[PDB]
């Protein structure tokens, strides 16, 4: 109802850097908010694409940002009669960036890895890796839980069981409040998908440079399966956390599997042991149901609700004609030991190829009325197709069909304005939460401010 569209702020990365592909609010120990922006195609110091991360401090004027430094040197270790190899070229560092307490976790989903042993190899494959940074101290750690030292043949001999070679760890990421990092790896287990989790604390204390293969004893990976429903499902394309079992002591995980069951797509709700609590099946094939997932209480009853994004959804029209507009599904959580049911509301896009529901961002209580609000991205929406982000205020009955406010891309065609979103953080300290929107195509991030 009250995000100011005129008083914008633009943070700008370098050309072709995809600055704003990912973003998040970050808070230092003193309490000061800044913005973390991931730029997965930033050039390295030797003119090769490695990706990067920038840590912008809040400024009304905005502008250029300082680079959060990471080691971009490839590594080799000849140990245990093998050769371990990291490859950071085209790794896409900052394809996802999440903040927790005084730590930042930027991931390079396409970081490759290989192991040589005599004339044999594990195969050069994108395991992924996350770089962790503690800015006010300067500490750095890594986490690459899909790296192995198993040779190509042994996988073939075991019908590719437990094949983590193509994980793309950090493809998606989230951190629980307690400090459990949760990484989506949709290429895990020959493209079934997997989740890897570990305490941030333990990732740090078990990391040393040069080791490459090491143990985070407290970590917990999800499971391999031979059920064809999960094949090529990209389980973990998106990930989020919330409370869905009544037990405040446990944390529940929401996983996105957009091509699950022959491109029907699904989103699952699991406990921290990766046991299924509920499954939400997609509506229409190839709609990518599960591209985006969001958790927030929108009807003000204290129980978290769930939002799923199917951005390639095709709506029916006159003369049996389908039209790709995108769709967001809202599931309110009921009381007692009751599962999520059918959708409480369906929000469909209006612009063709708009990819409505490509992003879904909880805004907190934007207008301070009691009910939490959200933003839904249509990155190629609006009559011109330059992009659009629609605000939706919450209410007792759930959400509104009619958006409260629409924001149009101030950037040129192609910016993907909306492809990333983050909110529920008061950046300027005026008492109202704000919203940062990314436009990786334009290499920029717009900041919108909430006003009385």
């Amino acid at each position, epitope marked *: 109802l009250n995000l100011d569209p005129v008083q914008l702020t633009f943070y700008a990365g370098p050309n072709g850097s995809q600055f704003g592909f990912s973003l998040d609010f970050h808070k230092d120990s003193h309490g000061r908010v800044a913005i973390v922006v991931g730029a997965p195609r930033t050039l390295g110091p030797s003119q090769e694409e490695t990706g990067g991360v920038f840590l912008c401090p809040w400024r009304a004027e905005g502008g250029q940002c300082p680079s959060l430094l990471f080691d971009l040197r490839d590594e080799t*270790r*000849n*140990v*245990g*009669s093998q050769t371990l190899q990291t490859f950071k070229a085209r790794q896409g560092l900052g394809a996802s960036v999440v903040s927790w307490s005084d730590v930042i976790v930027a991931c390079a989903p396409w970081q490759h890895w290989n192991v040589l042993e005599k004339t044999e190899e594990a195969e050069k494959t994108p395991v992924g890796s996350c770089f962790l940074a503690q800015p006010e101290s300067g500490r750095r750690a890594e986490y690459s839980p899909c790296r192995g*030292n198993t040779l190509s043949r042994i996988y073939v001999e075991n019908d590719f069981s437990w094949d983590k070679r193509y994980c793309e760890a950090g493809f998606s990421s989230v951190v629980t409040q307690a400090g459990e990092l949760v990484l989506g790896a949709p290429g895990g287990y020959y493209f079934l998908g997997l989740l890897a989790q570990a305490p941030v604390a333990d990732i740090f204390s*078990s*990391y*040393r440079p*040069g*080791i490459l*293969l*090491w*143990h985070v*004893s407290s970590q917990s990976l999800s499971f391999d399966s031979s059920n064809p429903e999960y094949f090529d499902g990209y389980w973990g394309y998106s990930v989020a956390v919330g409370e869905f079992d009544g037990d405040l002591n446990t944390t529940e995980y929401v996983v996105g599997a957009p091509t699950w069951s022959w491109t029907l797509g699904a989103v699952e709700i699991l406990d921290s042991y990766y046991q299924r609590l509920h499954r939400l099946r997609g509506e229409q094939m190839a709609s990518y149901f599960g591209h985006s997932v969001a958790v927030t209480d929108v009807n003000g009853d204290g129980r978290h609700d769930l939002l799923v994004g199917a951005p390639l959804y095709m709506e029916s029209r006159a003369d049996r004609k389908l039209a790709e507009v995108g769709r967001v599904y809202l599931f309110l959580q009921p009381r007692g030991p009751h599962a999520l049911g059918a959708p409480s509301l369906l929000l469909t896009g209006t612009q063709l190829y708009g990819r409505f529901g490509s992003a879904i961002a909880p805004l907190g209580d934007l207008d301070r009325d009691g009910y939490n609000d959200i933003a839904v991205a249509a990155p190629y929406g609006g009559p011109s197709g330059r992009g659009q982000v629609l605000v939706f205020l919450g209410q007792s009955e759930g959400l509104r069909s009619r958006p409260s406010q629409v924001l149009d891309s101030p950037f040129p065609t192609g910016s993907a304005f909306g492809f990333s979103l983050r909110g529920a953080v008061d950046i300027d300290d005026n008492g109202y939460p704000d919203l940062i929107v990314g436009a990786y195509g334009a290499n920029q991030v717009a900041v919108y401010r909430a006003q009385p």
Partner: antibody
Amino acid sequence: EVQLQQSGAELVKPGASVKLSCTASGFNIKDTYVHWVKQRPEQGLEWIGRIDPANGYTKYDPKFQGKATITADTSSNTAYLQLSSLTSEDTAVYYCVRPLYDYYAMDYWGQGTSVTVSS
Amino acid sequence: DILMTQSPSSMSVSLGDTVSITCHASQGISSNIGWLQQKPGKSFMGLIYYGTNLVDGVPSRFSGSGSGADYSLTISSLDSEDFADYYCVQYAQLPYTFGGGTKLEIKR
């Protein structure tokens, strides 16, 4: 608290076999490689081999290939060293070992098991 | 098989001294070296892994150094607890191979 609890001292006969145990406490035996190491006063320390109990795969020093068979059981969290065709050269103290972080390291050791071969 | 020659086999030293043990590999092992301690009659404790990293809980006074095929363990300000045996192990190649040992002994 990581701790490897090895089995008690064995008095055994030449020609016979013995099987030593090493049971994980404060962790699961499948979490890392588990190694076996031989120690004697004069000859010193010798690496016998390793096992990855997740999948049972093993490596050995050619010296002990034929004598030593390393195995493990995730159900009981225990690794095992079996020595066939016992000789007086096998009279040693035997340790199981595992790393802390680095996959390939030798950081945490069991208390050691003494084997005495004698008629 | 890499050979690990450890020097000296024993040294007579006093409390408070800074001593160093050296370990020479038959070929380069790019920091893939651990150092171990065996106290009299007791079992083993890990001191260093990957050349310079202390195992959790090992006191600051222990330190690893070196590169290529030549490495050194340094104990600074010797404690009466530090009069034990010390071994290097390499894990660059299987089979893993150990040093001969160095025994710290009380000078008098």
